[PDB]
Amino acid sequence: SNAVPSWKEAEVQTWLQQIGFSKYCESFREQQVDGDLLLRMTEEELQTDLGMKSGITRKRFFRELTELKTFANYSTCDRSNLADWLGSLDPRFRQYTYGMVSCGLDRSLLHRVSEQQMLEDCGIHLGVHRARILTAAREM
Amino acid sequence: SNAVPSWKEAEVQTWLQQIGFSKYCESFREQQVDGDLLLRMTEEELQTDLGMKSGITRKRFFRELTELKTFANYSTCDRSNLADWLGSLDPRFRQYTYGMVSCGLDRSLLHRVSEQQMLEDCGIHLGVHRARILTAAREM
Amino acid sequence: SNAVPSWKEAEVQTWLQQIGFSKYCESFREQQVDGDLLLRMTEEELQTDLGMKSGITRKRFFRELTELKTFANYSTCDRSNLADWLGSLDPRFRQYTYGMVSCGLDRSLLHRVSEQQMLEDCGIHLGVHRARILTAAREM
Amino acid sequence: SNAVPSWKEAEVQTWLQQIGFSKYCESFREQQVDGDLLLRMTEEELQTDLGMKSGITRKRFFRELTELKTFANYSTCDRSNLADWLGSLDPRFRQYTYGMVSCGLDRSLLHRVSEQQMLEDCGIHLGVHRARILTAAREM
Amino acid sequence: SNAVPSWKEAEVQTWLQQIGFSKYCESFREQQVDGDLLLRMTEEELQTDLGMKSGITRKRFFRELTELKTFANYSTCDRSNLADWLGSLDPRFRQYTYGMVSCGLDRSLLHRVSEQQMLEDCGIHLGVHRARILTAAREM
Amino acid sequence: SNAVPSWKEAEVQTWLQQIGFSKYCESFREQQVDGDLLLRMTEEELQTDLGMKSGITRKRFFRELTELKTFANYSTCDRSNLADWLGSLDPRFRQYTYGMVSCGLDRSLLHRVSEQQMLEDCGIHLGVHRARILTAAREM
Amino acid sequence: NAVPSWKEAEVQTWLQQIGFSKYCESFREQQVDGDLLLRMTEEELQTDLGMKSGITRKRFFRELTELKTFANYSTCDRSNLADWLGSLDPRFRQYTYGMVSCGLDRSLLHRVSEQQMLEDCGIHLGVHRARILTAAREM
Amino acid sequence: NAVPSWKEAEVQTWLQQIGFSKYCESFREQQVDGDLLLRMTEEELQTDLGMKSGITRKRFFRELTELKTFANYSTCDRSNLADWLGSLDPRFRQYTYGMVSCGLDRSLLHRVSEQQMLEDCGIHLGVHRARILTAAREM
Question: What induces or represses its expression, per the UniProt entry (chains A, B, C, D, E, F)?
Fold first, then answer.
């Protein structure tokens, strides 16, 4: 299955095993992590609520989570095809699709987005990424 | 029933079971949570006063609470139909109805509201949402 | 009786019973809470000095206290009838009467009050409320 | 006797009995509180040094102390009759007499006093009160 | 004796007895407090090094120390008769003589002294006092 | 093999032995450190997650890691040959290749990079280095 | 009298001459000589030398300030910075070693900022910094 | 004499010649060589080498400043930055390794800011930063 936003708990459990994170399978089930929560996973939630203590292990997790976000199918929630707009700018920018869609952004609104909003609301932590997406949104 | 602002404890208890939160039923009853308190629920009250320690569980709770706020009937307290003004801007903006109505806002007053008031007093935490409501309130 | 500013401990004890807060009768008795102290009640005093640990219980209390402050008779201390001026502007504003009257405000002085003074001295915590009262004070 | 500035420890003990604060008599005795210290009392001293833990009890104490300060005899230390100048402006302003006389203010010097000085040096905590005293002092 | 700057431990021990502070005699003796240290006594030194925990007791101490500083003989260290310059402005300003003389000030230098220097270096904590001394220094 | 970006855990373990850090082999294996994590290693990760407590030992580690980063094989991930651009500017600058490539920079994008981005996102901690790279990017 | 040239023995003798024999061995185990004595900080007294009492520390700096004021700095003050400070005010001579230690001289005085005098030279009294600044600029 | 090229043996010998034999085993267990010795910070001495006393650390940096001042930097300073700093003021030669480590030379000095000398080169004295900056601009 590829529609990560529509994933239930079972689909997340399978993904943890294919990425070598069987250690955290039961934790993700007692917390009832589904696709929506997995795509919005934060550094604090991994450490405190899921028991992922090592910062290096967390960095491995976000490495795999970024890979999943990059090749996910967002058609069921991305009406303006925001994913392929980010992808046409740079392939690694497709990971930010669900973050921008969760706070109600689309192609029509990109020119009104500020860099702080991309940080606080969309979860775009890399400044170089914010700078290129911000600039590309202005030249439309 | 659908008029959440008018909900008594029984309606909150039924709603908690329909969303799979029976585990927290007695906590919501000992605290005597009704519709007004449920609509004004903060993250600290869930953690401290209702025993919902997991931040992931809280995010699931606010996921269900945001959907309830979005499709609730506010006729008994929103006389200026502020809900449909928010809804016509974006369906997900309807959740902020009770927050704005609780601090005495209506359509007549929207153009005089600042973003700090929307953050501190109305509870609109997403910056993109505050910016969009501000712009629409000014075009009148 | 209804003149809360003139209430002694007996009237406060009766009011707690009528709002279902008999559980906190004994606490309000050892602290000797009368009408003046009840009208100037703060959240910190409820938590620390009266033993109201739950923030949800405190929010219910201020819900009832706001109802009492809104429909109280302030004739014994409000010489300029500031209560009905606030009330005619918005029903929710009549609760702030005792706070403004305690620091010596009246209709004659309202136009000289700043928004910070309303927060620090009168206890108007909602920014939208301060903004509306300030504007109305200037239109006279 | 009413000349609080000239009070020794005996007169303070009598006053504590007249306001129902016999519980704190011995604390005021070992700390050797006289009239000068009573008129300059701060909340931190009540809490830490006199053992008055309850914030509600402290608010009751300052209620009695403010009435004592308002109707006190300042003949022995108020050389410019600053008390009757404050009182003629507003009866509630007479409480600030000793705080202003202790740092050497008089009628001659009032126009040179800033609002920051009234807070830090004179102990006028209410902002609305500081603003009214400033305005009246400059219009002389 | 009145020339406090020349006091050794014996004169300080006697002064503590005449003001009713015999309880702290031993502390002042083991710490070897003489006249110079007594005139430069700070609140931190009383609390930490001399065991004066009560803030009310410290306020009583500085009440007596201010009385001693006011009527002291500064002939042995005040070449410009700075004491009588302060005294002619206001009698209680004479207490600040040793503080200003210790940092090398005199009448010749008064006109370039700033309000921060009077606070940090001379120990004039009352703002109203600093404002009048500043004004007098510029009118020379 | 010199292509550190493609290194697996086995290649990292071999490198630790060649630099005399066999003591930390087990830590690097339980944390599953590969080439990508090794090139992005931070001082906080060494101390907290890998047990390298001594700051002097950590400084020795970064000495060896900087040597590895300087002469590494970037053919598998450096599409614009950014390493040889940095190297032609100064040999010590080649260490920053993976940091810039990890956030997707290339020769085409260098002129749009700010000094804050080189610090927060690329990991160029030396200010003199950031200043020289920024200047060279502008002269193109 | 050449405090900058003092070895540990001279510091031990001076501690006895000012009534601080109680702290003699502490200054000995820490190997305090003239250079360290002239650069003594309050944190070093409390933590490393065991002088817990802040009042005792104030007595120490009272005696140390007298020593700094009348010391002979000829062996390290080539521009006679001590007598420049002294002509401005006798008590300003104590700051000589602090200013000489960070490489200052008369040639450099007009280029010194007040923050440099606070952080680097150790002139903590603001009134003193203001007076030295004014005199350094009028040259 | 070439401190940048010193291995652990030379550091152990230097500690003995300065009377710091007490800390020989610490410098050996931490494997301190010439490069680490020249980049020694106060935090590393206190936490990692066990030098608890702040006075002992000040004595150490006193000797380390002597070593840094008279070291031979030919093996890493091709622009002879050491003798440029030294000719400006003898105490400035210690900053050679700190500046050479971040790739600076005479050609680059005029582009260095005062903040860079603090954060990157380790020139903690403000008066020193001000003097080097001014001299670097007159070239």
Answer: Up-regulated by lipopolysaccharides (LPS).
